[PDB]
């Protein structure tokens, strides 16, 4: 039941100090394996940062040495990461693992938690419905959408009718023209049911603790 999930902030101003904790359950830190941290940049990039032996000894990546530090608290089976002098390249997803100490054997990866570094304030998103307009679709199977535009930063969780019915849904990855993220989600729902049965768009921007549902109609 070796459950380890990281938690920390999500957005931070560059040239500051990022520091997130990783808590492990089911097993005891002072019992074996090394407890390291690893970050992943947009695809094609994974980087071992450093670890902390059950012994309490630590080994850092020469790259982030002099700017990183790993501590622990045996009393609460949770180990931490401290990265100072943060810039922008320090924006990636952060995972902690149980990479067996000594070398390697049977690892256990956390869920992850992204961290973007920027100056950008934290703005919420305005959602807009995407209704059709009486066509040959008003006979077949209709496709409805929902548009989230202008929020910061990632992530964003969208669902359709509070989870109720996901079959046939495509949520597209966010992009940005300036320093704002826009994203869209579509749902193809049977024509004979559209108007009558209402469809609601669901979006939550944790960072701003935002939550919005948006019904859709002709």
């Amino acid at each position: 039941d070796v459950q380890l999930q990281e938690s920390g902030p999500g957005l931070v101003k560059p040239s500051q100090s990022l520091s997130l904790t990783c808590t492990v359950t089911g097993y005891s830190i002072s019992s074996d394996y090394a407890w390291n941290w690893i970050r992943q940049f947009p695809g094609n990039k994974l980087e071992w940062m450093g670890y902390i032996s059950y012994s309490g000894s630590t080994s850092y990546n020469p790259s982030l040495k002099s700017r990183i530090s790993i501590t622990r608290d045996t009393s609460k089976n949770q180990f931490f990461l401290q990265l100072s002098s943060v810039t922008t390249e320090d924006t990636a997803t952060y995972y902690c693992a149980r990479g067996y100490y000594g070398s390697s054997h049977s690892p256990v990866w956390g869920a992850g938690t992204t961290v973007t570094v920027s100056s950008a304030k934290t703005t919420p998103p305005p959602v807009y419905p995407l209704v059709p307009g009486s066509l040959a679709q008003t006979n077949s199977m209709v496709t409805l959408g929902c548009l989230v535009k202008g929020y910061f930063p990632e992530p964003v969780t969208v669902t359709w009718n509070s989870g109720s019915l996901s079959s046939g849904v495509h949520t597209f990855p966010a992009v940005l023209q300036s320093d704002l993220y826009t994203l869209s989600s579509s749902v193809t729902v049977p024509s004979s049911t559209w108007p009558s049965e209402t469809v609601t768009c669901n979006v939550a921007h944790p960072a701003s603790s935002t939550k919005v549902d948006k019904k859709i109609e002709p």
Partner: protein
């Protein structure tokens, strides 16, 4: 400074196929103590999982298909019947400190052609009334991913001001879905009449067209 350059980078195959890749270092990592290797994988949306370890020691997961080989310097991962869900990215890592990772391979399965189901969407009312007006255009469940798209405001082509975005392939029906969003202002918008988004796919010589005029105001 110990590298692990992996190749190839991408890869298109069909249900069942010798998917065998290699990771080549700049030193040994299999035989020098306890340090060996490992190949993890990850579905776009979840942290890696264990598959191999010690260079060639399948996990309790689901071996037989995936297999680890090679040692010392050059290694090779091998899966014979490329299961459908297998789609993911594959990585290799060593342990001679600082533990470094290999580039990674994207594995997308090949399937039958499929014309995109295009649907266009006029600007939301709540939007127009905010100086912002953005037209959207969806292209769902097509393959191959190769596909050009274009807007024709009142006939002419519109270049800048559009943001495209693709969804990666899914397990259900190995296909792609892309979303195009031409943005502009409330003003210039009402300044024109018809809004078209044409798509060119290899599935049809003739471009797929869906558009609309403001005949309902």
């Amino acid at each position: 400074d110990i590298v692990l350059t992996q190749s190839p980078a991408s890869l298109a195959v069909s249900l069942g196929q010798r998917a065998t890749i290699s990771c080549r270092a700049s030193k040994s990592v299999s035989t020098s103590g306890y340090g060996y290797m490992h190949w993890n994988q990850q579905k776009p949306g979840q942290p890696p999982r264990l598959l191999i370890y010690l260079v060639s020691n399948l996990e309790s997961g689901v071996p037989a298909r995936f297999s680890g080989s090679g040692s010392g310097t050059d290694f090779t991962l091998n899966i014979h019947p490329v299961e459908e869900e297998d789609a993911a990215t594959y990585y290799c890592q060593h342990i001679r400190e600082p533990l470094t990772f290999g580039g990674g391979t994207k594995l997308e399965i090949k399937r039958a052609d499929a014309a995109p189901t295009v649907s266009i969407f006029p600007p939301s009312s709540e939007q127009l009334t905010s100086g912002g007006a953005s037209v959207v255009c969806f292209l769902n469940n097509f393959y191959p991913k190769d596909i050009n798209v274009k807007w024709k405001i009142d006939g002419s082509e519109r270049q800048n001001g559009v943001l495209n975005s693709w969804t990666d392939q899914d397990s259900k029906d190995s296909t792609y879905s892309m979303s195009s969003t031409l943005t502009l202002t409330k003003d210039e918008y009402e300044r024109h009449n018809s809004y078209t988004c044409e798509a060119t796919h290899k599935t049809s010589t003739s471009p797929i067209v869906k558009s609309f005029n403001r005949n309902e105001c």
